[PDB]
């Protein structure tokens, strides 16, 4: 109730004397009494009598900051979470008010006494279920209200560079954990857009700080760009054309109110990458892939701006081509490109545009650009292959055509000899055939996989080390597992001749390389069963037809 008096008391009393008297009252409270109550009290303070600020704001706040900073981390912040959120929200709300009074300098004071605090808080206040959204709203409001001058004033000019580096990396990984795992119900489109705009602002500011204190200027400790581009791309990985399209105004509404944020995201990242300069090569292979998907964005303009970066990075290798060429780059390019395209992302115009830009760039340049030209022709062939594959897949929805086209791409990769993706679609086909219960064909495909292996011990490449389970798996052991599986398939495939055939080499391997006679016994048991099956029962013959397509 004491705050209830403050209005008319000020109406008949000094402003600042009132301010200091209430401050003295409050600070006199022992540190462990009625904390929520004092928070409500200071709220009932701030919402009023702060419409005028010049004489009180600067003196009222310091105490308020003291309480909230004690509320930062005392291991007992659990009850006052929502109350502190209320305090922070209301004070920032009042601050953003225009008529109330100039506060940009006071904004700076709040920034300096609040920013690391609240960031640390929401870092610790990390669970999605609680009223996290309130804190997030508070801090994004803070970001919106601040200024680039503010941003760079002290937060960019901290103590030892190590501390500011830690702060920056914490902030970046946090933004990643926010964009990923969004905090709202996905219906608060206004909120998401506002959050995106303020995050644009913040990440821009932290881009200039990276440039001005972490270029070759900081000749060392130049890793964080990995996190930075990761965060940027993840932010660049939503809010796309179709979502913009649902209502015809949706494109229009968003663009008029926000524009294509993705456009400036892409251009900022493009110029930043250009700014990397000499560090580009030390930075290419990890982030090759992270560029395709943004290049794969369904727009036109930033795509036009973005494919040229591919020539830029192959050229960066061309500088580094003293040891070989961009083979490491293009391998990753092929692989990634495969995953995203088969994910159902690209377009034909995309492939045309890629060919145009890369050819144009390579004309100006040397022999290695001719190699890039022929490999771009290769890439275009790959792209058209995948596009035909996907259009048939989502067009016909008949497993037959699916198998046909996946065999086509399998043969294409075998022609291109890129073995790993070949294995990937081989396993895809195995899944398909099992779905069809075509045990024999699944067995054959899985055999083609197994055929690549050897009875040696050293696992030569992790390419054969697939995604099903990933640990040592000596080629010997994996080959054993595959042979067991194929034997089972043939067994239920009712084709025991091949079963016995493979059983023979498997027994050979057991008895001459691993000497596990238990395996011998089980395998021979199965082989005897096979011979019994051959001799005893009978099997129908499948009719064979000729099909002439014309």
């Amino acid at each position: 109730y004491l705050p209830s008096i403050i209005n008319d008391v000020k109406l008949v009393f000094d402003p600042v004397e009132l301010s200091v008297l209430f401050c003295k009252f409050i600070q006199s409270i022992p540190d462990n009494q009625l904390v929520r109550q004092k928070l409500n009290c200071m709220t009932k303070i701030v919402e009023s009598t702060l419409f005028r600020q010049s004489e009180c704001r600067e003196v009222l706040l310091p105490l308020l900051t003291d309480q909230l900073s004690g509320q930062l981390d005392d291991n007992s912040n659990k009850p006052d979470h929502e109350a502190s959120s209320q305090l922070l929200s209301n004070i920032l709300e009042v601050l953003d008010r225009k008529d109330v009074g100039a506060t940009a300098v006071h904004i700076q004071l709040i920034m300096e006494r609040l920013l690391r605090r609240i960031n640390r808080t929401v870092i610790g206040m990390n669970r999605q279920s609680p009223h996290i959204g309130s804190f997030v709203a508070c801090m994004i409001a803070l970001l919106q209200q601040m200024d680039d001058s503010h941003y760079s004033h002290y937060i960019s000019t901290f103590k030892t560079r190590q501390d500011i580096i830690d702060f920056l990396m914490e902030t970046f990984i946090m933004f990643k954990d926010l964009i990923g795992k969004n905090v709202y119900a996905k219906d608060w489109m206004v909120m998401n857009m506002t959050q995106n705009r303020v995050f644009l602002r913040a990440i821009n500011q932290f881009a200039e700080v990276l440039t001005r204190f972490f270029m070759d200027q900081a000749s060392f400790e130049l890793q964080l760009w990995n996190n930075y581009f990761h965060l940027a791309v993840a932010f660049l990985t939503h809010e796309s054309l179709q979502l913009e399209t649902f209502s015809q105004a949706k494109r229009n509404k968003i663009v008029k109110k926000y524009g294509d944020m993705r456009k400036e995201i892409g251009f900022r990242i493009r110029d930043m990458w250009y700014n990397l300069g000499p560090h580009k090569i030390k930075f290419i292979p990890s982030m090759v892939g992270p560029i395709l998907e943004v290049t794969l964005t369904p727009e036109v303009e930033l795509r036009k701006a973005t494919i040229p970066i591919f020539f830029d990075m192959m050229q960066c290798e061309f500088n580094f081509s003293g040891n070989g060429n961009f083979h490491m780059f293009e391998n990753e390019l092929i692989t990634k490109l495969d995953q995203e395209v088969e994910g159902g992302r690209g377009d034909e115009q995309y492939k045309v545009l890629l060919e145009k830009l890369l050819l144009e760039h390579c004309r100006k340049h040397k022999y290695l650009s001719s190699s890039g030209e022929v490999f771009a022709l290769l890439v275009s062939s790959l792209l058209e292959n995948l596009l035909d594959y996907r259009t048939i897949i989502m067009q016909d929805e008949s497993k037959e055509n699916r198998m046909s086209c996946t065999v086509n791409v399998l043969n294409f990769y075998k022609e291109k000899k890129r073995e790993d993706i070949y294995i990937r679609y081989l396993y895809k086909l195995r899944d398909l055939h099992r779905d069809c219960e075509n045990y024999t064909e699944a067995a054959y495909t899985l055999l083609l996989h197994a055929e690549l292996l050897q009875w040696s011990d050293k696992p030569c490449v992790p390419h054969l080390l697939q995604r099903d389970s990933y640990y040592v798996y000596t080629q010997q052991e994996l080959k054993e597992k595959l042979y067991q599986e194929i034997i089972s398939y043939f067994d239920k495939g009712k084709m025991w001749e091949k079963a016995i055939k493979l059983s023979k080499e498997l027994a050979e391997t057991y008895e001459s390389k691993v000497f596990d006679y238990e395996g011998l016994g089980n395998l021979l048991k199965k082989r005897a069963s096979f011979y019994e099956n051959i001799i005893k029962a009978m099997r129908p013959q499948p009719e064979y037809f000729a099909v002439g397509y014309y």
């Binding site: 920032l92 409001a141 709202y184 219906d187 206004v190 909120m191 705009r197 105004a249 109110k257």
Partner: protein, 269 residues
């Protein structure tokens, strides 16, 4: 045909009926074809239509229902009442999306929500018509604004659509990035309305007492209407009828006695 002049005082390019297709860029221009004309001829107007915002159409001045007004009705003072017209345009766009989802619905077995959509659609369109005129009192304006906002937000809900804020004055002020925290408060209030309506779907669409409780908690004064029809009593003399509210448990009356004079002829005196 010649002499076209760029202007933005012809936003409301309004037809009369299905236009003739005499122009290579004109067709049976539908009744509801508001067209963003870019160029003025004295007798003709050519520019973007609502149906195609990338194609022109030369449409007669006599056929055009000329309206110098633009999307903003305060610069030229076109509002029948300021602060209400934004609501009608937004609800018209809402009706457009209702039509789209409508096409999307019959093809599916969602006929229950489809029919409830029909009835909310009737309610919304009749409210649209009745608020086209500013004849209603200001309290009526506020009440319509509130209830139609609730209805449209609900419609966005079960259709899985985004939300809006700024209950009054066209629902646009807060989405004008005026603040951030108050925006969060508005969004949270919108979610409050949403949770109200999701819990009350099963409360009104099924039950009829929870709505009464919610309505009667908001007000305090009530009046019981009694409409006497005829008195049947074998008296033969003049009768006085003292009907009033009574508390049998408390053995006392609740309302003051209302007196009726009844004649001896079977009819009230």
């Amino acid at each position: 045909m010649a002499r076209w002049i760029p202007t933005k005082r012809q936003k409301y390019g309004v037809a009369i009926y299905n236009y003739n297709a005499s122009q290579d860029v004109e067709l049976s221009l539908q009744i509801g074809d508001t067209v963003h004309i870019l160029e003025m001829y004295e007798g003709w107007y050519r520019g973007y239509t609502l149906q195609n915002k990338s194609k022109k159409g030369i449409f007669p001045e006599t056929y055009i229902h000329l309206k110098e007004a633009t999307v903003e009705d305060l610069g030229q003072h076109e509002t029948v009442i300021p602060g209400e017209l934004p609501l009608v345009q937004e609800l018209t766009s809402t009706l457009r999306e209702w039509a789209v989802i409508w096409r999307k619905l019959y093809v599916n077995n969602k006929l229950t929500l489809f029919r409830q959509l029909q009835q909310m659609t009737y309610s919304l369109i009749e409210w649209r018509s009745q608020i086209l005129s500013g004849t209603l009192p200001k309290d009526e304006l506020a009440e319509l604004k509130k209830k139609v906002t609730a209805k449209i937000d609900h419609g966005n809900r079960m259709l899985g659509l985004d939300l809006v804020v700024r209950d009054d004055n066209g629902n646009i002020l807060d989405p004008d990035e005026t603040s951030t925290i108050a925006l969060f408060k508005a969004h949270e209030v919108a979610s409050k309305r949403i949770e109200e309506k999701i819990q009350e779907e099963k409360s009104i669409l099924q039950n009829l007492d929870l709505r009464g409780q919610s309505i009667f908690s908001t007000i305090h004064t009530y009046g019981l209407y009694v409409n006497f029809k005829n008195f049947v009593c074998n008296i033969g003399e003049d009768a006085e009828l003292f009907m009033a509210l009574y508390d049998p448990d408390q053995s006392t009356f609740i309302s003051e006695n209302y007196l009726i004079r009844w004649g001896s002829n079977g009819m009230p005196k």
